[PDB]
Symmetry: D2
Subunit: 28 residues, 4 copies
Protein backbone atom coordinates (compact mmCIF):
# COMPACT_ATOMS: atom_id res chain seq x y z
CA UNK A 1 0.00 0.00 0.00
CA UNK A 2 2.09 2.99 1.32
CA UNK A 3 4.84 3.05 -1.38
CA UNK A 4 2.19 2.76 -4.18
CA UNK A 5 0.22 5.62 -2.49
CA UNK A 6 3.42 7.76 -2.74
CA UNK A 7 3.95 6.80 -6.44
CA UNK A 8 0.25 7.47 -7.38
CA UNK A 9 0.48 10.85 -5.52
CA UNK A 10 3.60 11.58 -7.66
CA UNK A 11 1.53 10.69 -10.81
CA UNK A 12 -1.26 13.19 -9.81
CA UNK A 13 1.48 15.83 -9.29
CA UNK A 14 3.17 15.14 -12.70
CA UNK A 15 -0.28 15.10 -14.44
CA UNK A 16 -1.05 18.47 -12.67
CA UNK A 17 2.35 19.73 -13.97
CA UNK A 18 1.12 19.06 -17.56
CA UNK A 19 -2.01 21.21 -16.87
CA UNK A 20 0.39 23.97 -15.63
CA UNK A 21 2.60 23.50 -18.76
CA UNK A 22 -0.39 23.52 -21.23
CA UNK A 23 -1.46 26.97 -19.81
CA UNK A 24 1.82 28.30 -21.42
CA UNK A 25 4.22 25.76 -23.11
CA UNK A 26 6.65 23.72 -20.90
CA UNK A 27 7.22 25.66 -17.56
CA UNK A 28 10.32 24.81 -15.41
CA UNK B 1 -5.45 22.75 -24.16
CA UNK B 2 -9.11 21.91 -23.23
CA UNK B 3 -9.27 18.31 -24.64
CA UNK B 4 -5.89 17.22 -23.13
CA UNK B 5 -6.77 19.18 -19.93
CA UNK B 6 -10.05 17.20 -19.45
CA UNK B 7 -8.15 13.91 -20.04
CA UNK B 8 -5.29 14.84 -17.61
CA UNK B 9 -8.03 15.59 -14.99
CA UNK B 10 -9.53 12.12 -15.78
CA UNK B 11 -6.03 10.54 -15.21
CA UNK B 12 -5.84 12.29 -11.76
CA UNK B 13 -9.34 10.93 -10.91
CA UNK B 14 -8.44 7.33 -12.02
CA UNK B 15 -5.12 7.56 -10.08
CA UNK B 16 -7.13 8.85 -7.02
CA UNK B 17 -9.64 5.96 -7.43
CA UNK B 18 -6.53 3.68 -7.37
CA UNK B 19 -5.48 5.27 -3.99
CA UNK B 20 -9.01 4.44 -2.69
CA UNK B 21 -8.70 0.80 -3.97
CA UNK B 22 -5.28 0.14 -2.28
CA UNK B 23 -6.74 1.19 1.13
CA UNK B 24 -8.98 -1.98 1.09
CA UNK B 25 -5.75 -4.11 1.08
CA UNK B 26 -5.46 -7.58 -0.61
CA UNK B 27 -8.95 -7.22 -2.24
CA UNK B 28 -9.83 -8.03 -5.92
CA UNK C 1 -2.09 -7.06 -7.96
CA UNK C 2 -4.36 -8.15 -10.89
CA UNK C 3 -7.08 -5.39 -10.90
CA UNK C 4 -4.53 -2.64 -9.92
CA UNK C 5 -2.32 -3.89 -12.83
CA UNK C 6 -5.37 -3.53 -15.16
CA UNK C 7 -6.13 0.01 -13.84
CA UNK C 8 -2.43 1.07 -14.31
CA UNK C 9 -2.45 -0.52 -17.84
CA UNK C 10 -5.55 1.65 -18.62
CA UNK C 11 -3.56 4.75 -17.44
CA UNK C 12 -0.75 3.87 -19.94
CA UNK C 13 -3.43 3.33 -22.63
CA UNK C 14 -5.25 6.68 -22.00
CA UNK C 15 -1.90 8.55 -21.65
CA UNK C 16 -0.80 7.01 -25.03
CA UNK C 17 -4.16 8.12 -26.55
CA UNK C 18 -3.24 11.75 -25.59
CA UNK C 19 0.03 11.39 -27.63
CA UNK C 20 -2.15 10.31 -30.62
CA UNK C 21 -4.57 13.27 -30.12
CA UNK C 22 -1.66 15.77 -29.64
CA UNK C 23 -0.10 14.56 -32.97
CA UNK C 24 -3.24 15.88 -34.82
CA UNK C 25 -2.78 19.33 -33.05
CA UNK C 26 -6.26 20.58 -34.27
CA UNK C 27 -8.59 17.68 -33.15
CA UNK C 28 -10.54 16.74 -29.95
CA UNK D 1 3.52 18.77 -28.61
CA UNK D 2 7.15 17.65 -27.89
CA UNK D 3 7.32 18.67 -24.16
CA UNK D 4 3.82 17.25 -23.27
CA UNK D 5 4.73 14.18 -25.41
CA UNK D 6 8.00 13.57 -23.44
CA UNK D 7 6.10 14.07 -20.15
CA UNK D 8 3.12 11.77 -21.06
CA UNK D 9 5.81 9.13 -21.94
CA UNK D 10 7.30 9.78 -18.44
CA UNK D 11 3.77 9.06 -17.00
CA UNK D 12 3.63 5.75 -19.01
CA UNK D 13 7.10 4.79 -17.67
CA UNK D 14 6.30 5.76 -14.01
CA UNK D 15 2.97 3.82 -14.27
CA UNK D 16 4.94 0.85 -15.81
CA UNK D 17 7.50 1.06 -12.94
CA UNK D 18 4.48 0.71 -10.57
CA UNK D 19 3.61 -2.66 -12.27
CA UNK D 20 7.24 -3.85 -11.67
CA UNK D 21 6.96 -2.79 -7.97
CA UNK D 22 3.49 -4.44 -7.47
CA UNK D 23 4.97 -7.79 -8.72
CA UNK D 24 6.99 -8.02 -5.40
CA UNK D 25 3.66 -7.81 -3.39
CA UNK D 26 5.35 -8.24 0.09
CA UNK D 27 7.90 -5.35 -0.45
CA UNK D 28 7.27 -1.60 -1.21
Amino acid sequence: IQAIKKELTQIKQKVDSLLENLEKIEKE
